[PDB]
Amino acid sequence: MWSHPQFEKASTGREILEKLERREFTREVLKEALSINDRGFNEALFKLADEIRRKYVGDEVHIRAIIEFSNVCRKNCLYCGLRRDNKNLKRYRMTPEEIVERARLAVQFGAKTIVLQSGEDPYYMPDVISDIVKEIKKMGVAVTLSLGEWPREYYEKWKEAGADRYLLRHETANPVLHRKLRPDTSFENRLNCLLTLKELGYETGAGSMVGLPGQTIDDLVDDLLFLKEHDFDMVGIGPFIPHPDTPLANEKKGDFTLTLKMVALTRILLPDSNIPATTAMGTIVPGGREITLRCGANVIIPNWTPSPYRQLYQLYPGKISVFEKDTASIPSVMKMIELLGRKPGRDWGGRKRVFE
Ligand SMILES: Nc1ncnc2c1ncn2[C@@H]1O[C@H](CSCC[C@H](N)C(=O)O)[C@@H](O)[C@H]1O
Ligand code: SF4
Ligand SMILES: [Cl-]
Ligand SMILES: [Cl-]
Ligand SMILES: [Cl-]
Ligand SMILES: [Cl-]
């Protein structure tokens, strides 16, 4: 019959940016934004996200000092170096005293939030965690937990102990892919944990990997819409990095640009959310965290795990620099912040509601 030509790419690209600026976040708009492979479009997207960042979360880059206190995990996620079937990794557990005193040292170096992260290690759950949380809360700082999926009763105990925030990335909002990559659990379980945490009054963090095997652009759009639906306080996003001692060893690595676009779109969708420049972004590209901080991120998470454990928390290859002294990360990120013309957080850096 009659013809159906495409609009010119330049004019399409400009209309998408205009729709984002007017906050018309249709599925087709988000899909096209993630599908365009044009450096000028991408740069404009990043500039929009940076503008939104400046307006609604300002110039503070919040520093969260993480202690990865055990690499023992009862789960078997296909992507993760810590999966239980990986026997080519030395496992470790830190004592409560080691954890508490290491947190105290971060606080003295100026960290206003301590993040405690581990594999799903039953040793500590729930009472050892509670005791550690109570001790760190006496230091005058925020406490964030990232311990995986546990019963409501454990989450309730940890909140009573004084925990402020919980990070539980949704990983992938595609339920079919979620079950294939995380064969012990389900997207439904993961979402129920996130809903429970919010109900209990935690500030909650979700987020996802970009470039997982079997994940499409339509799946990434579903990730963005899920994030928007829940108005998450925090969103952690990074590229999938294949680990050699996992079933996903020979799969494609996630793409840096596409991941940066996911960060920028997250900022645009959730203007006053706390969004880190993740270590995975710094792993895949030299200076990756600094780039991400100019594309909508406003949080950085220096690695505060001590030797000799630090080098064993091998979620993905390249994660830990072996040349670094284990107290170098906090000063390092402070210098990075200074060089970007930003400033460290003044207070605990809790999510505020200033948009709308
Ligand atoms: N191969 C890989 N590439 C990139 N990020 C990875 C990865 N393996 C794991 N991660 C990320 O590292 C995060 C921490 S795992 C530790 C916390 C807890 N076990 C949990 O699963 O929530 C995960 O949420 C995941 O998104
Ligand atoms: S992602 Fe978290 S739950 Fe899954 S294997 Fe790794 S440490 Fe365990
Ligand atoms: Cl945090
Ligand atoms: Cl994160
Ligand atoms: Cl990361
Ligand atoms: Cl670091």
Side-chain angles (χ1 to χ4, degrees), residues 66 68 70 72-73 75 77-82 116-121 145-150 166-172 182 190 206-210 212 236-243 246 248 254 278 280 313-317 319:
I66 194 168
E68 303 150 325
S70 166
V72 172
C73 197
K75 279 184 168 58
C77 310
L78 270 59
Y79 47 79
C80 184
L82 307 193
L116 299 180
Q117 186 176 85
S118 61
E120 294 196 4
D121 180 356
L145 299 179
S146 185
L147 312 182
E149 297 166 34
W150 296 101
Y166 202 103
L167 315 178
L168 191 74
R169 290 185 187 187
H170 72 277
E171 312 298 6
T172 176
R182 311 189 65 248
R190 201 71 166 177
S208 55
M209 287 170 287
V210 176
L212 287 166
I237 294 166
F240 166 59
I241 299 173
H243 189 296
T246 72
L248 306 184
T278 59
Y313 195 81
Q314 302 182 14
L315 304 177
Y316 47 79
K319 179 177 179 305

Tab-separated table of all heavy atoms in Angstrom, residues 66 68 70 72-73 75 77-82 116-121 145-150 166-172 182 190 206-210 212 236-243 246 248 254 278 280 313-317 319, ligand 1:
chain	number	residue	atom	x	y	z
A	66	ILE	N	31.646	0.488	53.746
A	66	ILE	CA	31.152	-0.882	53.773
A	66	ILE	C	32.175	-1.845	54.368
A	66	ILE	O	33.376	-1.805	54.046
A	66	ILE	CB	30.672	-1.322	52.396
A	66	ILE	CG1	29.856	-2.607	52.462
A	66	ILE	CG2	31.811	-1.470	51.358
A	66	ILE	CD1	29.148	-2.892	51.158
A	68	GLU	N	32.417	-5.892	54.492
A	68	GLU	CA	31.925	-7.130	53.935
A	68	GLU	C	32.442	-8.222	54.893
A	68	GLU	O	33.568	-8.709	54.780
A	68	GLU	CB	32.415	-7.289	52.501
A	68	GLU	CG	32.011	-6.133	51.576
A	68	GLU	CD	33.012	-5.885	50.447
A	68	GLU	OE1	34.241	-6.067	50.673
A	68	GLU	OE2	32.573	-5.448	49.369
A	70	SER	N	31.525	-11.347	56.019
A	70	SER	CA	31.541	-12.783	55.814
A	70	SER	C	31.242	-13.017	54.349
A	70	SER	O	30.378	-12.377	53.802
A	70	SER	CB	30.463	-13.490	56.650
A	70	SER	OG	30.308	-14.838	56.184
A	72	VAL	N	30.464	-16.186	53.435
A	72	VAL	CA	29.742	-17.435	53.458
A	72	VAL	C	28.323	-17.165	52.948
A	72	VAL	O	27.664	-16.252	53.451
A	72	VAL	CB	29.667	-17.980	54.905
A	72	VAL	CG1	28.748	-19.192	54.990
A	72	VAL	CG2	31.047	-18.309	55.472
A	73	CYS	N	27.841	-17.994	52.016
A	73	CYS	CA	26.510	-17.813	51.485
A	73	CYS	C	25.806	-19.162	51.333
A	73	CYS	O	26.371	-20.073	50.793
A	73	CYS	CB	26.442	-17.079	50.149
A	73	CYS	SG	24.735	-16.510	49.881
A	75	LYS	N	23.028	-19.411	49.521
A	75	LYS	CA	22.415	-19.386	48.183
A	75	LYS	C	23.429	-19.712	47.076
A	75	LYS	O	24.625	-19.895	47.305
A	75	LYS	CB	21.731	-18.026	47.978
A	75	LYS	CG	20.366	-17.988	48.632
A	75	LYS	CD	19.608	-16.735	48.381
A	75	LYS	CE	18.156	-16.827	48.790
A	75	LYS	NZ	17.891	-17.160	50.216
A	77	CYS	N	23.287	-18.130	43.608
A	77	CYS	CA	23.006	-17.273	42.471
A	77	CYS	C	24.047	-17.522	41.349
A	77	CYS	O	25.270	-17.637	41.606
A	77	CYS	CB	22.938	-15.807	42.883
A	77	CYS	SG	21.867	-15.488	44.302
A	78	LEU	N	23.548	-17.653	40.097
A	78	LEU	CA	24.410	-18.066	39.007
A	78	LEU	C	25.509	-17.061	38.712
A	78	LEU	O	26.528	-17.454	38.189
A	78	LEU	CB	23.602	-18.369	37.749
A	78	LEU	CG	23.139	-19.818	37.649
A	78	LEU	CD1	22.293	-20.252	38.798
A	78	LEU	CD2	22.437	-20.115	36.315
A	79	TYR	N	25.292	-15.783	39.035
A	79	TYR	CA	26.209	-14.719	38.673
A	79	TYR	C	27.312	-14.490	39.711
A	79	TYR	O	28.307	-13.806	39.399
A	79	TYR	CB	25.444	-13.417	38.390
A	79	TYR	CG	24.400	-13.091	39.445
A	79	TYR	CD1	24.709	-12.532	40.679
A	79	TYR	CD2	23.076	-13.372	39.218
A	79	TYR	CE1	23.747	-12.271	41.658
A	79	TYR	CE2	22.105	-13.111	40.178
A	79	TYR	CZ	22.448	-12.543	41.383
A	79	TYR	OH	21.484	-12.276	42.321
A	80	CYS	N	27.120	-14.988	40.929
A	80	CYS	CA	27.864	-14.501	42.097
A	80	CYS	C	29.033	-15.422	42.449
A	80	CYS	O	28.849	-16.628	42.627
A	80	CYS	CB	26.933	-14.319	43.298
A	80	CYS	SG	27.791	-13.614	44.737
A	81	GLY	N	30.226	-14.833	42.605
A	81	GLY	CA	31.397	-15.587	43.017
A	81	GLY	C	31.246	-16.266	44.391
A	81	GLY	O	31.948	-17.214	44.698
A	82	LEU	N	30.343	-15.751	45.236
A	82	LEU	CA	30.142	-16.270	46.583
A	82	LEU	C	29.150	-17.436	46.603
A	82	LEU	O	28.936	-18.049	47.660
A	82	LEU	CB	29.701	-15.197	47.574
A	82	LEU	CG	30.574	-13.951	47.661
A	82	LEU	CD1	30.206	-13.164	48.872
A	82	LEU	CD2	32.030	-14.324	47.689
A	116	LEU	N	26.956	-2.828	56.593
A	116	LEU	CA	27.369	-4.182	56.916
A	116	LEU	C	26.776	-5.088	55.849
A	116	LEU	O	25.580	-5.105	55.693
A	116	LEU	CB	26.854	-4.558	58.296
A	116	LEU	CG	27.344	-3.726	59.465
A	116	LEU	CD1	26.745	-4.213	60.758
A	116	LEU	CD2	28.842	-3.664	59.531
A	117	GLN	N	27.609	-5.817	55.108
A	117	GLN	CA	27.167	-6.680	54.032
A	117	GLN	C	27.846	-8.034	54.195
A	117	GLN	O	29.001	-8.142	54.647
A	117	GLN	CB	27.539	-6.093	52.676
A	117	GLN	CG	26.957	-6.904	51.521
A	117	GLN	CD	27.226	-6.315	50.177
A	117	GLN	OE1	28.292	-6.549	49.593
A	117	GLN	NE2	26.282	-5.548	49.693
A	118	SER	N	27.122	-9.073	53.811
A	118	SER	CA	27.653	-10.417	53.827
A	118	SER	C	26.916	-11.275	52.828
A	118	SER	O	25.841	-10.910	52.357
A	118	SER	CB	27.529	-11.038	55.228
A	118	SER	OG	26.166	-11.139	55.650
A	119	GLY	N	27.485	-12.461	52.551
A	119	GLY	CA	26.637	-13.544	52.070
A	119	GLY	C	25.546	-13.855	53.086
A	119	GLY	O	25.593	-13.395	54.229
A	120	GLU	N	24.566	-14.663	52.661
A	120	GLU	CA	23.526	-15.140	53.551
A	120	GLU	C	24.162	-16.217	54.421
A	120	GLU	O	24.116	-17.425	54.094
A	120	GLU	CB	22.319	-15.651	52.779
A	120	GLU	CG	21.609	-14.545	52.019
A	120	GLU	CD	20.206	-14.975	51.580
A	120	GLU	OE1	19.786	-16.113	51.945
A	120	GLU	OE2	19.559	-14.197	50.858
A	121	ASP	N	24.766	-15.738	55.514
A	121	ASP	CA	25.531	-16.574	56.416
A	121	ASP	C	24.739	-16.786	57.707
A	121	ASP	O	24.672	-15.911	58.568
A	121	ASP	CB	26.872	-15.950	56.742
A	121	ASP	CG	27.692	-16.798	57.694
A	121	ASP	OD1	27.213	-17.836	58.175
A	121	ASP	OD2	28.846	-16.444	57.912
A	145	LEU	N	22.151	-2.248	56.565
A	145	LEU	CA	22.370	-3.690	56.451
A	145	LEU	C	22.127	-4.140	55.026
A	145	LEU	O	21.202	-3.626	54.362
A	145	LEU	CB	21.437	-4.430	57.396
A	145	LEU	CG	21.601	-4.129	58.870
A	145	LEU	CD1	20.544	-4.947	59.650
A	145	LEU	CD2	22.993	-4.435	59.399
A	146	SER	N	22.948	-5.111	54.565
A	146	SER	CA	22.772	-5.706	53.251
A	146	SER	C	23.074	-7.193	53.416
A	146	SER	O	24.145	-7.653	53.081
A	146	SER	CB	23.714	-5.027	52.262
A	146	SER	OG	23.488	-5.499	50.945
A	147	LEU	N	22.140	-7.958	53.992
A	147	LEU	CA	22.408	-9.336	54.394
A	147	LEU	C	21.564	-10.347	53.625
A	147	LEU	O	21.608	-11.543	53.925
A	147	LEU	CB	22.108	-9.493	55.889
A	147	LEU	CG	22.704	-8.419	56.791
A	147	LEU	CD1	22.380	-8.716	58.227
A	147	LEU	CD2	24.217	-8.354	56.605
A	148	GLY	N	20.793	-9.888	52.642
A	148	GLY	CA	19.966	-10.801	51.869
A	148	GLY	C	18.565	-11.000	52.403
A	148	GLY	O	18.001	-10.165	53.133
A	149	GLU	N	17.995	-12.154	52.034
A	149	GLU	CA	16.596	-12.498	52.349
A	149	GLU	C	16.522	-13.309	53.645
A	149	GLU	O	17.086	-14.400	53.767
A	149	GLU	CB	16.025	-13.371	51.223
A	149	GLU	CG	15.985	-12.645	49.897
A	149	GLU	CD	15.747	-13.495	48.647
A	149	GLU	OE1	14.982	-14.496	48.771
A	149	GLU	OE2	16.334	-13.190	47.587
A	150	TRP	N	15.761	-12.792	54.613
A	150	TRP	CA	15.590	-13.381	55.944
A	150	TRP	C	14.142	-13.202	56.350
A	150	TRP	O	13.412	-12.422	55.731
A	150	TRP	CB	16.565	-12.728	56.982
A	150	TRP	CG	17.968	-13.032	56.585
A	150	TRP	CD1	18.826	-12.201	55.957
A	150	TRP	CD2	18.641	-14.262	56.796
A	150	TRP	NE1	20.003	-12.861	55.704
A	150	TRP	CE2	19.912	-14.127	56.212
A	150	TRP	CE3	18.303	-15.470	57.394
A	150	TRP	CZ2	20.846	-15.140	56.239
A	150	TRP	CZ3	19.223	-16.488	57.383
A	150	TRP	CH2	20.480	-16.321	56.822
A	166	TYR	N	18.262	-0.666	54.739
A	166	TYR	CA	18.559	-2.021	54.244
A	166	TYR	C	18.643	-1.971	52.730
A	166	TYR	O	17.771	-1.392	52.084
A	166	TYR	CB	17.454	-2.957	54.670
A	166	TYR	CG	17.835	-4.400	54.709
A	166	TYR	CD1	18.100	-5.008	55.944
A	166	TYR	CD2	18.013	-5.152	53.552
A	166	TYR	CE1	18.551	-6.314	56.009
A	166	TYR	CE2	18.396	-6.488	53.621
A	166	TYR	CZ	18.642	-7.066	54.855
A	166	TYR	OH	19.067	-8.377	54.903
A	167	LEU	N	19.700	-2.550	52.172
A	167	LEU	CA	19.898	-2.672	50.745
A	167	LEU	C	19.554	-4.092	50.301
A	167	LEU	O	20.133	-5.049	50.795
A	167	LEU	CB	21.353	-2.398	50.357
A	167	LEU	CG	21.981	-1.176	51.022
A	167	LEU	CD1	23.440	-1.055	50.595
A	167	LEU	CD2	21.166	0.038	50.628
A	168	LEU	N	18.626	-4.214	49.345
A	168	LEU	CA	18.264	-5.512	48.810
A	168	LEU	C	17.926	-5.322	47.331
A	168	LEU	O	16.795	-5.095	46.952
A	168	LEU	CB	17.116	-6.102	49.608
A	168	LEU	CG	16.841	-7.567	49.294
A	168	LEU	CD1	17.893	-8.463	49.886
A	168	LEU	CD2	15.508	-7.990	49.852
A	169	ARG	N	18.962	-5.359	46.496
A	169	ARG	CA	18.741	-5.132	45.081
A	169	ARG	C	17.742	-6.147	44.552
A	169	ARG	O	17.837	-7.313	44.903
A	169	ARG	CB	20.040	-5.242	44.307
A	169	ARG	CG	21.024	-4.097	44.559
A	169	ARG	CD	22.193	-4.293	43.628
A	169	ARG	NE	23.257	-3.350	43.895
A	169	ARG	CZ	24.316	-3.271	43.103
A	169	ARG	NH1	24.437	-4.100	42.066
A	169	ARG	NH2	25.214	-2.340	43.347
A	170	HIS	N	16.796	-5.687	43.716
A	170	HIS	CA	15.856	-6.618	43.128
A	170	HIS	C	16.477	-7.508	42.038
A	170	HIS	O	15.896	-8.528	41.676
A	170	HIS	CB	14.547	-5.934	42.704
A	170	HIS	CG	14.713	-5.061	41.510
A	170	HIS	ND1	15.175	-3.765	41.539
A	170	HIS	CD2	14.487	-5.399	40.208
A	170	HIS	CE1	15.230	-3.328	40.277
A	170	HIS	NE2	14.813	-4.325	39.434
A	171	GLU	N	17.656	-7.120	41.533
A	171	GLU	CA	18.525	-7.876	40.617
A	171	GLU	C	17.976	-7.829	39.179
A	171	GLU	O	18.701	-7.425	38.236
A	171	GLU	CB	18.822	-9.316	41.062
A	171	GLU	CG	19.263	-9.425	42.524
A	171	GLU	CD	20.538	-8.707	42.889
A	171	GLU	OE1	21.099	-7.985	42.052
A	171	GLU	OE2	20.958	-8.891	44.048
A	172	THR	N	16.720	-8.305	39.021
A	172	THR	CA	15.992	-8.309	37.757
A	172	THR	C	14.518	-8.412	38.081
A	172	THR	O	14.118	-9.253	38.894
A	172	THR	CB	16.442	-9.393	36.763
A	172	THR	OG1	15.576	-9.339	35.618
A	172	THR	CG2	16.467	-10.762	37.405
A	182	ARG	N	18.623	-17.145	40.124
A	182	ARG	CA	18.615	-17.226	41.575
A	182	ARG	C	17.726	-18.406	41.964
A	182	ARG	O	16.569	-18.248	42.420
A	182	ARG	CB	18.131	-15.898	42.156
A	182	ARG	CG	18.821	-14.666	41.584
A	182	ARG	CD	18.495	-13.377	42.302
A	182	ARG	NE	18.995	-13.413	43.654
A	182	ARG	CZ	18.319	-13.460	44.802
A	182	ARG	NH1	17.029	-13.254	44.830
A	182	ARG	NH2	18.975	-13.667	45.946
A	190	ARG	N	11.789	-11.769	46.798
A	190	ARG	CA	12.625	-10.572	46.884
A	190	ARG	C	11.779	-9.330	47.107
A	190	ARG	O	12.109	-8.514	47.964
A	190	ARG	CB	13.415	-10.404	45.578
A	190	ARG	CG	14.660	-9.538	45.675
A	190	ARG	CD	15.746	-10.227	46.444
A	190	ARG	NE	17.033	-9.547	46.250
A	190	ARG	CZ	18.142	-9.910	46.860
A	190	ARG	NH1	18.169	-10.997	47.597
A	190	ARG	NH2	19.259	-9.211	46.696
A	206	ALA	N	16.805	-0.746	46.395
A	206	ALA	CA	16.661	-1.798	45.402
A	206	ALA	C	17.725	-1.540	44.335
A	206	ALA	O	18.750	-0.948	44.629
A	206	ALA	CB	15.219	-1.846	44.892
A	207	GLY	N	17.472	-2.001	43.112
A	207	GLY	CA	18.413	-1.880	42.043
A	207	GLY	C	18.686	-3.214	41.387
A	207	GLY	O	18.142	-4.226	41.766
A	208	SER	N	19.554	-3.185	40.401
A	208	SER	CA	19.640	-4.274	39.451
A	208	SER	C	20.996	-4.290	38.767
A	208	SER	O	21.750	-3.326	38.834
A	208	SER	CB	18.506	-4.248	38.461
A	208	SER	OG	18.444	-2.980	37.802
A	209	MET	N	21.273	-5.435	38.163
A	209	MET	CA	22.429	-5.521	37.277
A	209	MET	C	21.947	-5.264	35.855
A	209	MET	O	20.819	-5.600	35.454
A	209	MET	CB	23.098	-6.886	37.399
A	209	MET	CG	23.860	-7.051	38.690
A	209	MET	SD	24.420	-8.765	39.005
A	209	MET	CE	22.844	-9.497	39.428
A	210	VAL	N	22.841	-4.740	35.050
A	210	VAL	CA	22.606	-4.433	33.642
A	210	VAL	C	23.513	-5.319	32.805
A	210	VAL	O	24.734	-5.373	33.032
A	210	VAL	CB	22.922	-2.928	33.383
A	210	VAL	CG1	22.777	-2.587	31.914
A	210	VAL	CG2	22.022	-2.111	34.288
A	212	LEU	N	22.738	-8.679	32.187
A	212	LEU	CA	22.670	-10.092	32.585
A	212	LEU	C	22.361	-10.952	31.371
A	212	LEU	O	21.704	-10.514	30.417
A	212	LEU	CB	21.551	-10.284	33.619
A	212	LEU	CG	21.798	-9.756	35.018
A	212	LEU	CD1	20.482	-9.713	35.810
A	212	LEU	CD2	22.814	-10.621	35.745
A	236	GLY	N	20.777	0.884	43.742
A	236	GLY	CA	22.134	0.485	43.362
A	236	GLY	C	22.135	-0.224	42.009
A	236	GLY	O	21.468	-1.257	41.836
A	237	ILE	N	22.884	0.333	41.046
A	237	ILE	CA	22.937	-0.241	39.720
A	237	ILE	C	24.385	-0.410	39.283
A	237	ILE	O	25.250	0.451	39.486
A	237	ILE	CB	22.178	0.655	38.729
A	237	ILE	CG1	20.683	0.699	39.026
A	237	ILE	CG2	22.452	0.207	37.281
A	237	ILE	CD1	19.906	1.803	38.334
A	238	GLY	N	24.668	-1.595	38.727
A	238	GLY	CA	25.945	-1.814	38.132
A	238	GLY	C	25.850	-2.820	37.003
A	238	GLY	O	24.843	-3.506	36.806
A	239	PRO	N	26.938	-2.918	36.223
A	239	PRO	CA	26.998	-3.878	35.148
A	239	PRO	C	27.195	-5.280	35.719
A	239	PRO	O	27.889	-5.454	36.710
A	239	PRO	CB	28.256	-3.497	34.362
A	239	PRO	CG	29.127	-2.811	35.441
A	239	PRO	CD	28.148	-2.141	36.389
A	240	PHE	N	26.606	-6.264	35.042
A	240	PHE	CA	26.977	-7.655	35.305
A	240	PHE	C	28.423	-7.892	34.869
A	240	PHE	O	28.791	-7.580	33.744
A	240	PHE	CB	26.017	-8.592	34.557
A	240	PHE	CG	26.495	-10.018	34.490
A	240	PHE	CD1	26.736	-10.739	35.649
A	240	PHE	CD2	26.776	-10.598	33.265
A	240	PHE	CE1	27.224	-12.023	35.565
A	240	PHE	CE2	27.231	-11.907	33.186
A	240	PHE	CZ	27.459	-12.615	34.340
A	241	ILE	N	29.236	-8.429	35.781
A	241	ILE	CA	30.617	-8.766	35.467
A	241	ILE	C	30.788	-10.271	35.612
A	241	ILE	O	30.734	-10.804	36.712
A	241	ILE	CB	31.605	-7.980	36.337
A	241	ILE	CG1	31.430	-6.478	36.074
A	241	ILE	CG2	33.022	-8.408	36.007
A	241	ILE	CD1	32.223	-5.603	37.000
A	242	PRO	N	30.989	-11.021	34.520
A	242	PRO	CA	31.104	-12.485	34.604
A	242	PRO	C	32.257	-12.904	35.517
A	242	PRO	O	33.377	-12.346	35.445
A	242	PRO	CB	31.356	-12.920	33.162
A	242	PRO	CG	30.787	-11.820	32.332
A	242	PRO	CD	30.972	-10.558	33.129
A	243	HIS	N	31.976	-13.889	36.372
A	243	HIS	CA	32.957	-14.491	37.275
A	243	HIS	C	33.369	-15.863	36.772
A	243	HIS	O	32.536	-16.727	36.474
A	243	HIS	CB	32.361	-14.572	38.675
A	243	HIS	CG	33.354	-14.963	39.714
A	243	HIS	ND1	34.003	-16.177	39.753
A	243	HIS	CD2	33.747	-14.274	40.802
A	243	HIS	CE1	34.824	-16.196	40.809
A	243	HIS	NE2	34.662	-15.049	41.477
A	246	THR	N	31.873	-19.458	38.022
A	246	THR	CA	30.426	-19.483	38.046
A	246	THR	C	29.910	-20.010	36.716
A	246	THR	O	30.660	-20.039	35.732
A	246	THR	CB	29.758	-18.122	38.294
A	246	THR	OG1	29.914	-17.321	37.109
A	246	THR	CG2	30.304	-17.414	39.521
A	248	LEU	N	28.105	-18.571	34.639
A	248	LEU	CA	27.998	-17.472	33.709
A	248	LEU	C	29.372	-16.945	33.272
A	248	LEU	O	29.421	-15.916	32.617
A	248	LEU	CB	27.134	-16.381	34.305
A	248	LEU	CG	25.749	-16.832	34.774
A	248	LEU	CD1	24.964	-15.628	35.253
A	248	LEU	CD2	24.995	-17.556	33.700
A	254	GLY	N	28.303	-6.778	31.060
A	254	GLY	CA	27.417	-5.662	30.907
A	254	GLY	C	28.143	-4.451	30.364
A	254	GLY	O	29.326	-4.236	30.605
A	278	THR	N	28.645	2.823	41.739
A	278	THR	CA	29.013	1.566	42.356
A	278	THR	C	30.427	1.119	42.012
A	278	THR	O	31.010	1.468	40.996
A	278	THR	CB	28.006	0.473	41.959
A	278	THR	OG1	27.993	0.330	40.551
A	278	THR	CG2	26.598	0.785	42.444
A	280	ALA	N	31.298	-1.698	40.854
A	280	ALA	CA	31.283	-2.368	39.551
A	280	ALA	C	31.497	-1.398	38.395
A	280	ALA	O	32.203	-1.752	37.459
A	280	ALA	CB	30.073	-3.229	39.366
A	313	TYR	N	36.394	-11.341	49.209
A	313	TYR	CA	34.976	-11.047	48.957
A	313	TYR	C	34.804	-10.819	47.454
A	313	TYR	O	34.484	-9.732	46.973
A	313	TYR	CB	34.520	-9.877	49.808
A	313	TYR	CG	33.030	-9.727	49.894
A	313	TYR	CD1	32.306	-10.512	50.787
A	313	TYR	CD2	32.362	-8.787	49.121
A	313	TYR	CE1	30.945	-10.323	50.931
A	313	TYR	CE2	30.996	-8.591	49.262
A	313	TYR	CZ	30.290	-9.370	50.162
A	313	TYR	OH	28.931	-9.199	50.300
A	314	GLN	N	35.021	-11.892	46.696
A	314	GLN	CA	35.228	-11.876	45.258
A	314	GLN	C	33.897	-12.068	44.524
A	314	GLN	O	33.681	-13.088	43.852
A	314	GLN	CB	36.262	-12.965	44.869
A	314	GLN	CG	37.600	-12.778	45.564
A	314	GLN	CD	38.648	-13.808	45.171
A	314	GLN	OE1	38.497	-14.535	44.186
A	314	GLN	NE2	39.722	-13.905	45.945
A	315	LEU	N	33.003	-11.081	44.614
A	315	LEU	CA	31.710	-11.144	43.908
A	315	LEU	C	31.920	-11.278	42.403
A	315	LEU	O	31.191	-12.021	41.749
A	315	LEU	CB	30.884	-9.879	44.117
A	315	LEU	CG	30.578	-9.460	45.525
A	315	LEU	CD1	29.812	-8.157	45.430
A	315	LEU	CD2	29.746	-10.504	46.225
A	316	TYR	N	32.924	-10.550	41.885
A	316	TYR	CA	33.274	-10.506	40.470
A	316	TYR	C	34.765	-10.182	40.347
A	316	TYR	O	35.382	-9.577	41.232
A	316	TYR	CB	32.415	-9.493	39.689
A	316	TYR	CG	32.284	-8.150	40.320
A	316	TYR	CD1	33.308	-7.213	40.212
A	316	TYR	CD2	31.185	-7.815	41.097
A	316	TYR	CE1	33.207	-5.978	40.826
A	316	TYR	CE2	31.090	-6.581	41.724
A	316	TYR	CZ	32.113	-5.664	41.607
A	316	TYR	OH	32.039	-4.401	42.204
A	317	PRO	N	35.426	-10.564	39.254
A	317	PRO	CA	36.845	-10.286	39.094
A	317	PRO	C	37.089	-8.786	38.986
A	317	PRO	O	36.268	-8.047	38.434
A	317	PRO	CB	37.258	-11.009	37.819
A	317	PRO	CG	35.973	-11.233	37.083
A	317	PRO	CD	34.894	-11.334	38.137
A	319	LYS	N	37.300	-6.687	41.483
A	319	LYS	CA	36.598	-5.905	42.492
A	319	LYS	C	37.559	-5.215	43.473
A	319	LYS	O	37.348	-4.059	43.799
A	319	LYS	CB	35.641	-6.814	43.273
A	319	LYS	CG	34.895	-6.073	44.372
A	319	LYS	CD	33.931	-6.961	45.064
A	319	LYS	CE	33.159	-6.323	46.189
A	319	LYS	NZ	34.058	-5.710	47.214
B	1	LIG	N1	28.866	-10.940	38.855
B	1	LIG	C1	28.382	-9.800	39.362
B	1	LIG	N2	28.471	-8.667	38.642
B	1	LIG	C2	27.996	-7.525	39.151
B	1	LIG	N3	27.375	-7.331	40.294
B	1	LIG	C3	27.260	-8.484	40.997
B	1	LIG	C4	27.702	-9.712	40.591
B	1	LIG	N4	27.441	-10.653	41.538
B	1	LIG	C5	26.774	-10.023	42.473
B	1	LIG	N5	26.649	-8.680	42.210
B	1	LIG	C6	25.939	-7.685	43.010
B	1	LIG	O1	26.433	-7.632	44.327
B	1	LIG	C7	25.331	-7.444	45.261
B	1	LIG	C8	25.673	-7.980	46.690
B	1	LIG	S1	25.594	-9.767	47.322
B	1	LIG	C9	25.661	-9.497	49.106
B	1	LIG	C10	24.300	-9.088	49.743
B	1	LIG	C11	23.247	-10.199	49.732
B	1	LIG	N6	23.867	-11.554	49.596
B	1	LIG	C12	22.284	-9.984	48.552
B	1	LIG	O2	22.333	-10.815	47.627
B	1	LIG	O3	21.510	-9.018	48.596
B	1	LIG	C13	24.135	-8.111	44.595
B	1	LIG	O4	22.898	-7.509	44.963
B	1	LIG	C14	24.440	-8.036	43.097
B	1	LIG	O5	23.614	-7.112	42.407
